[PDB]
């Protein structure tokens, strides 16, 4: 074998402790750059003029933040969707003021995480597996694309991308509610059904398999020792599990087929989260939640408030207060 | 505000940036407030006010025609914001205007379609690979590839 | 792919019980605190700094401004027994909006 | 910043006490007969 042939054999080797592969050739450097920049920025970055109004917001630990308040702050509204790599700045000091780290991080991250998804297909192929784990990962990935790329595109600025920080995330959520009434949007509602249901079914499946473990141990040892890695025989009794759950509800509401059950476990959260991602990605173009403001009117024409109108009052509070020095004109159009 | 007597070139906003007019990061004169992000916008109703250096203050002061005012007012009040039930405007707006921009309908629908088509691509590309190699129906119990591989540790 | 993996099916399935169940139990404890208004509302160090330094801003201080808007704008209709009348002039608002 | 002056010891013991409990248990497991 020549050098290229050998290199290819190593890259695609099924024997590396962590699989590299061709997607990994892009994933490794991009994820390392994003990680390193993030860590350094989160600790040490100076304040960033997120809203382009010369009002710098401090995100880093050394500049007065704790783990909860800290963030890498989105790039300046003055930049908008302009590409702002380090070399476009006159200095690192300028780059930092304008939120250059945010762009470097999210672009390397999105590239790296897309390659992470490809890499999941890639290894499944090398191991002779079925290929669709990567399709499940497309759900959180799509969600990351929605908040870091698609929303900024629709609104015309990376300053409206989700901040890389715990409190910045909450800021993004509250402002999103004000501007899109996301709670009243059916795609976010499907998302909630996806994650509440995902958690429910996770607990359900956990509890049912755990409930029907076949006795292989004594009381002075963990029942976990009753299963040995790679054993051929199933470790629980699915017939007893189905016997239980089918009586809890009724026979035909319970799965007796493990393949069907596990498919449902994959599908429910993944589809819901795809809708969550699509909610963000379509509210990115301002097709917003249901608006029933003043929908109910009496015989004279008096407005009779519903809970929708109370939501509206909360939303107004968010709207009027957010970015309190950034608006000069009466309508918030992006 | 200029009709009312404001000098829109020298009007300093609350932040120190021009209330109506400011510079882009490369110096072009652009509209101020949040729309600073949109300075790359180009449109027939706006372009006559554009000079070599961006928005021209002398053109702004002297050359704005009624058709430009009308168009800007029309476009401002038909912004592509609206609810799923087609109530036009911001999310806190009251019922009254039945409007969602065709631009929003067309962008959202095509994002959803493009996204699910990427999913279909992954689904079918991964399946085509597996079927071609002969393991799309599962792992052969008597020829499980991982069982012939050395342990990772 | 990830560096670690389950090797024990019994552990895997117990963990699937543990995680969402423990999460829900934790959220319940927080709500018991909220029954008493015993909130995690503030970071005191943040407030002391921001009160003395009008240039100090974090996403934490930004979210409190949003909260103050929510409270003032929703309370009169959301809490009708209080008979709140908040004149236009007292309502917290940023510029223009 | 005007932080709570007990936050440091609170955090350090919060980590150390249970971590140490686990290390003690782990090491004495390892030292048991194979």
């Amino acid at each position: 074998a020549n050098l290229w042939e050998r290199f290819c054999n190593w890259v695609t080797s099924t024997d590396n402790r962590l699989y590299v592969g061709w997607f990994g050739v892009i994933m490794i450097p991009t994820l390392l750059a994003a990680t390193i920049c993030f860590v350094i920025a989160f600790i040490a970055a100076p304040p960033v003029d997120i809203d382009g109004i010369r009002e710098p917001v401090s995100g880093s630990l050394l500049y007065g933040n704790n783990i909860i308040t800290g963030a890498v702050v989105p790039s300046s509204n003055a930049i908008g969707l302009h590409f702002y790599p380090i070399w476009e700045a006159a200095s690192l000091d300028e780059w930092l003021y304008n939120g250059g780290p945010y762009q470097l991080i999210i672009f390397h991250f999105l590239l790296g995480a897309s390659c992470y998804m490809g890499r999941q297909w890639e290894l499944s192929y090398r191991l002779g597996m079925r290929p669709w784990i990567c399709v499940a990962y497309s759900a959180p990935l799509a969600s990351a694309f929605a908040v870091f790329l698609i929303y900024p595109i629709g609104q015309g600025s990376f300053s409206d991308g989700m901040p890389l920080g715990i409190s910045g995330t909450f800021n993004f959520m509250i402002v999103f509610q004000a501007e899109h009434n996301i709670l009243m949007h059916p795609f976010h509602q499907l998302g909630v059904a996806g994650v509440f249901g995902g958690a429910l079914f996770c607990a359900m499946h956990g509890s049912l398999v755990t409930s029907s473990l076949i006795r292989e141990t004594t009381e002075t040892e963990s029942a976990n020792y009753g299963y040995k890695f790679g054993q051929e025989e199933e470790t629980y009794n699915i017939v007893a599990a189905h016997g239980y759950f089918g009586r809890l509800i009724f026979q035909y509401a319970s799965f007796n087929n493990s393949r069907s059950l596990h498919f449902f476990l994959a599908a429910w959260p993944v589809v819901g989260v795809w809708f969550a991602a699509l909610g963000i990605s379509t509210m990115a173009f301002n097709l917003n939640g249901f608006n029933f403001n003043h929908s109910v009117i009496d015989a004279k024409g008096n407005v009779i408030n519903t809970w929708a109108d109370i939501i509206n009052r909360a939303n107004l509070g968010m709207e009027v207060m957010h970015e309190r020095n950034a608006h000069n004109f009466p309508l918030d159009l992006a | 505000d200029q009709k009312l007597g404001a000098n829109v070139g020298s009007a300093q906003g609350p932040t120190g940036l021009g209330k109506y007019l400011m510079r882009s990061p490369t110096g072009e004169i652009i509209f101020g407030g949040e729309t600073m992000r949109f300075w790359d916008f180009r449109g027939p109703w706006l372009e006559p006010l554009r000079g070599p250096n961006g928005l021209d203050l002398n053109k702004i002061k002297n050359d704005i025609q009624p058709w430009q005012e009308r168009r800007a007012a029309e476009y401002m009040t038909h912004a592509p914001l609206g609810s799923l039930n087609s109530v036009g405007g911001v999310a806190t707006e009251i019922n009254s205007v039945n409007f969602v921009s065709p631009r929003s309908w067309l962008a959202t629908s095509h994002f959803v379609l493009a996204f699910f088509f990427l999913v279909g691509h992954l689904w079918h590309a991964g399946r085509a690979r597996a079927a071609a190699a002969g393991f799309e129906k599962g792992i052969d119990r008597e020829s499980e590839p991982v069982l012939s591989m050395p342990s990772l540790d | 792919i990830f560096g670690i993996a389950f090797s024990n099916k019994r552990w895997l399935h117990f963990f699937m019980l543990f995680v969402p169940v423990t999460g829900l139990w934790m959220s319940a404890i927080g709500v018991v605190g909220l029954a008493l208004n015993l909130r995690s509302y503030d970071f005191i160090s943040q407030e002391i700094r921001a009160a003395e330094d009008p240039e100090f801003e974090t996403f934490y201080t930004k979210n409190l401004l949003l909260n103050e808007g929510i409270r003032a704008w929703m309370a009169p209709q959301d809490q009708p027994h209080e008979n709140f009348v908040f004149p236009e002039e007292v309502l917290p608002r940023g510029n223009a909006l | 910043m005007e932080v709570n002056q007990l936050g440091l010891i609170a955090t350090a013991l919060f980590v150390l006490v249970p971590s140490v409990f686990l290390i003690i248990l782990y090491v004495q497991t390892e030292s048991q007969q194979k």
Binding site: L61, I67, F229, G230 | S151 | G3, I4 | L8, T11
Partner: peptide, 30 residues
């Protein structure tokens, strides 16, 4: 001191990842 604490805990977690991956008990088929 707070910053040191936060970074210290983070650094321990990263070290933990290293040991949990490269120095895990190996899975063995019985």
């Amino acid at each position: 001191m707070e910053t040191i604490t936060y970074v210290f805990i983070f650094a321990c977690i990263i070290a933990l990842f290293f040991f949990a991956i490269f120095f895990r008990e190996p899975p063995r088929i019985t």
